[PDB]
Amino acid sequence: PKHIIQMTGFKMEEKEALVKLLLKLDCTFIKSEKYKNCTHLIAERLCKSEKFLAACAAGKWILTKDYIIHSAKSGRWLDETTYEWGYKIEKDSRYSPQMQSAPKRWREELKRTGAPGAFHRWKVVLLVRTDKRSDSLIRVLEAGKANVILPKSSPSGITHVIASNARIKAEKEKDNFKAPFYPIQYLGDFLLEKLE
Amino acid sequence: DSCNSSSSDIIRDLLE
Ligand SMILES: [Cl-]
Ligand SMILES: [Cl-]
Ligand SMILES: [Mg+2]
Ligand SMILES: [Mg+2]
């Protein structure tokens, strides 16, 4: 039972105060803009950061900052349950019930089915606009245990083509792949919005 | 802060 902590959505001063409290607890803290396989993500708010989407895809704990404040005061890591994003749903919210519950939904669903991530058995080709990095999308996909097919790997068994501007590509270009095309937004929607 | 500049919406970033 490890506590590998990352934080998302906090400004520098808030982050400094929370990391100071981690010195009262046995744990690991990873400073990176990237998702680095944290067991517990502390999120300022529901969002679509790399850390938040990747933690959802891997069924990790995504919790409020009160989890750190109360655990440090108690001198011991507490039960995560009441601190989870998804423990209680706001009926009046800019965020859908599905999005508000997404961290809990995936954590419980992956435990129920035994799957190691939300994208397990996916074999994905990314056609991301050449002017930008696909790196964050790749780390989210891999956190969900998708197999991201590199250009030098065989296209056998591709399940998804996730493409910049998937909705305007000609059928002739789509015909270069057996698998269907999905827009970039599908990744976020599958995790946060879709009713499975 | 440059030391704390992670994106809060990596989907939105790819559409702009
Ligand atoms: Cl960080
Ligand atoms: Cl599109
Ligand atoms: Mg599991
Ligand atoms: Mg096709």
Numbering used by the authors:
A (entry chain A): 6 to 201
B (entry chain C): 437 to 452
Task: Share the article's original sentences.
Previous studies have shown that the tandem BRCA1 C-Terminal (BRCT) domain repeat (tBRCT) at the SLF1 N-terminus (SLF1tBRCT) plays a critical role in the Rad18-SLF1 association. We found that SLF1tBRCT utilizes mechanisms common among tBRCTs as well as unique ones for Rad18 binding, the latter include interactions with an α-helical structure in Rad18 that has not been observed in other tBRCT-bound ligand proteins.
Two SLF1tBRCT molecules were found in the asymmetric unit and electron densities for the Rad18-pSer442 peptide were found on both of them. The structure and crystal packing of the SLF1tBRCT-Rad18-pS442 complex are very similar to the SLF1tBRCT-Rad18-2P complex. Compared to the SLF1tBRCT-Rad18-2P complex, little structural differences were observed even for the SLF1 Arg50 and Rad18 Arg448 side chains, which interact with the pS444 phosphate group in the Rad18-2P peptide. The electron densities for the Rad18-pS442 peptide are weaker compared to electron densities for the Rad18-2P peptide, especially at the N-terminal region where Ser442 and Ser444 reside. Such a difference in density is in line with the reduced affinity of the Rad18-pS442 peptide toward SLF1tBRCT and supports the function of Ser444 phosphorylation in enhancing the Rad18-SLF1tBRCT binding.
